[PDB]
Write a protein that binds this ligand. Structure first.
Ligand SMILES: *[C@@H]1O[C@H](CO)[C@@H](O[C@@H]2O[C@H](CO)[C@@H](O)[C@H](O)[C@H]2NC(C)=O)[C@H](O)[C@H]1NC(C)=O
Lengths: 50, 49, 49, 49
């Protein structure tokens, strides 16, 4: 947690249905955007933390 | 394994979008029709109604 | 009706999924309550139901 | 010396200009543009926004 990592996701086509389905219990409370409408939108940059 | 559910490890992944949509590069799945000019139509350029 | 544990969310206004889309769909304007409970002791077979 | 006739036109034009310019205020919402705020958000909060 103290040394947290960043991976840059760019120049690709997203698919959030896989995350919807295959994760058993995954909370997924989101801020500033409706989760069910994440497929249509376009994003400047998507970064991943872990 | 004998620890309580409260102290069990959890994997957390945090996504950070940038919806200022200046270049737009990570557009999601969809399908693109043609372009028609000089006609009042419904356009959807880069997710903009 | 009876469903599995994972798709209990799909029975709710505004959410999508195979059960929500195809088996049971709630209206946008809904006035009511939903009750659900585990039925593992009651509807589960060793061979399979 | 015909300032009295000019002030009326100036006042009317300036008032119309400020009325047009007032559309830029976000009024505390996420965005001042309607189409994005419908597309970018879940309807229950869209109502108050
Ligand atoms: C991570 O989990 C597995 C890799 O082990 C993959 O998910 C599989 O996706 C296929 C696609 O049809 C399914 O048939 C499998 O049932 C899935 N397996 C599991 C364990 O979920 C995939 O590589 C990754 N999935 C996600 C959501 O990250």
């Amino acid at each position: 947690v103290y040394a947290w990592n960043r991976k840059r996701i760019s120049n690709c086509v997203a698919d959030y249905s896989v995350l919807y389905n295959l994760a058993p219990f995954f909370t997924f409370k989101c801020y500033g955007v409706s989760p069910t409408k994440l497929n249509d939108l376009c994003f400047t940059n998507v970064y991943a933390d872990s | 394994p004998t620890y309580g559910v409260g102290h069990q490890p959890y994997r957390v992944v945090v996504l950070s979008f940038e919806l200022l949509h200046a270049p737009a590069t990570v557009c999601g799945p969809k399908k693109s029709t043609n372009l028609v000019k000089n006609k009042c139509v419904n356009f959807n350029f880069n997710g903009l109604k | 009706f009876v469903i599995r544990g994972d798709e209990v969310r799909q029975i709710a206004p505004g959410q999508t999924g195979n059960i929500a889309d195809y088996n049971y769909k709630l209206p946008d304007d809904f006035t009511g309550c939903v009750i659900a409970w585990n039925s593992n002791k009651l509807d589960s077979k060793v061979s399979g139901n | 010396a015909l300032g009295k006739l000019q002030d009326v036109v100036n006042h009317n034009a300036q008032a119309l200009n400020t009325l047009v310019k007032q559309l830029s205020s976000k009024f505390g919402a996420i965005s001042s543009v309607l189409n994005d705020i419908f597309s970018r958000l879940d309807p229950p909060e869209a109502e108050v926004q």
